[PDB]
């Protein structure tokens, strides 16, 4: 299938004392493979998947240097944006950055992205053509002009369409045993009698990878949305994911309802029904 490499960066200023809390996480698809945490002792980019440990000392020195460069930029930005928004020095603020690249089944470049937020709101983002910027407000507009004059988009494009795609392909190969393995959901259904006339059917999907999945209820062969509940997909903690969907039904009518499961790891969609 298609694949992605994504990096997520968060800095939170500490007005009370010291430098911002800085946390970087790297993903291939839904697999975290590196992290940097300013609160950790190592002060190094650290491995979080076995297949990245194949990389030698030069890799780790380079990623450490570069991710520390990210943290300093974030620190400087927190100061700059505080001024742009005329904010006090007393408050804590947050900067968030995410960027990365998608490749298709053929591992050819598909898309690139780079977005930036201040205090949880869009600040500036690279457009889909990777040639121009979306600035949410007049502060971000100042940044946009600065980045245009310095041709940041062009430099970013060289990474996103070039180096980023080459890294992703390197990782997919090195980690193929897991990265290219699909874990179909382990499914089952539970039954809970809430009262004497209603029952809840819950359709479970467990231990699947990647995270993308569709759970739908049908009644007599038609999609049921009324009286259903779907939880957000959640990590199992072992690299796989979980999800469930439930429907309230009249007692004795359970047989009418079917749960339908779609996942890349499934050759055909699954259908479950309480009988």
């Amino acid at each position: 299938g298609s694949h992605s490499m994504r990096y997520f960066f968060t800095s939170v200023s500490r007005p009370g004392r010291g430098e911002p809390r800085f946390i970087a996480v790297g993903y291939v698809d839904d697999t975290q493979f590196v992290r940097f945490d300013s609160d950790a002792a190592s002060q190094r980019m650290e491995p979080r998947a076995p297949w990245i440990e194949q990389e030698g000392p030069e890799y780790w020195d380079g990623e450490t240097r570069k991710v520390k460069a990210h943290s300093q930029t974030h620190r400087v930005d927190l100061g700059t944006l505080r001024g742009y928004y005329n904010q006090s020095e007393a408050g804590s603020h947050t900067v968030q950055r995410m960027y990365g690249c998608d490749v298709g089944s053929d591992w050819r470049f598909l898309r690139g992205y780079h977005q930036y937020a201040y205090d949880g709101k869009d600040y500036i983002a690279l457009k889909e053509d990777l040639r121009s910027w979306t600035a949410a407000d007049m502060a971000a507009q100042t940044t946009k002009h600065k980045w245009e004059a310095a041709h940041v988009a062009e430099q970013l494009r060289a990474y996103l369409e070039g180096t980023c795609v080459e890294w992703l392909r390197r990782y997919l190969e090195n980690g193929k045993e897991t990265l290219q393995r699909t874990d179909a959901p382990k499914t089952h259904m539970t039954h809970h009698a809430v009262s004497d006339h209603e029952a809840t059917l819950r359709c479970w999907a467990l231990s699947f990878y990647p995270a993308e999945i569709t759970l739908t209820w049908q009644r007599d062969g038609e999609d049921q949305t009324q009286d259903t509940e779907l939880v957000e997909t959640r990590p199992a903690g072992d690299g796989t994911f979980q999800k469930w969907v439930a429907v309230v039904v009249p007692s004795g009518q359970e047989q009418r309802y079917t749960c339908h499961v779609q996942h890349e790891g499934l050759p055909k969609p699954l259908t479950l029904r309480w009988e």
Binding site: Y7, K66, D77, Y99, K146, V152, Q155, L156
Partner: peptide, 9 residues
Amino acid sequence: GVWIRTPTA
């Protein structure tokens, strides 16, 4: 691997 540049805002 992360981007080699990190321009300030």
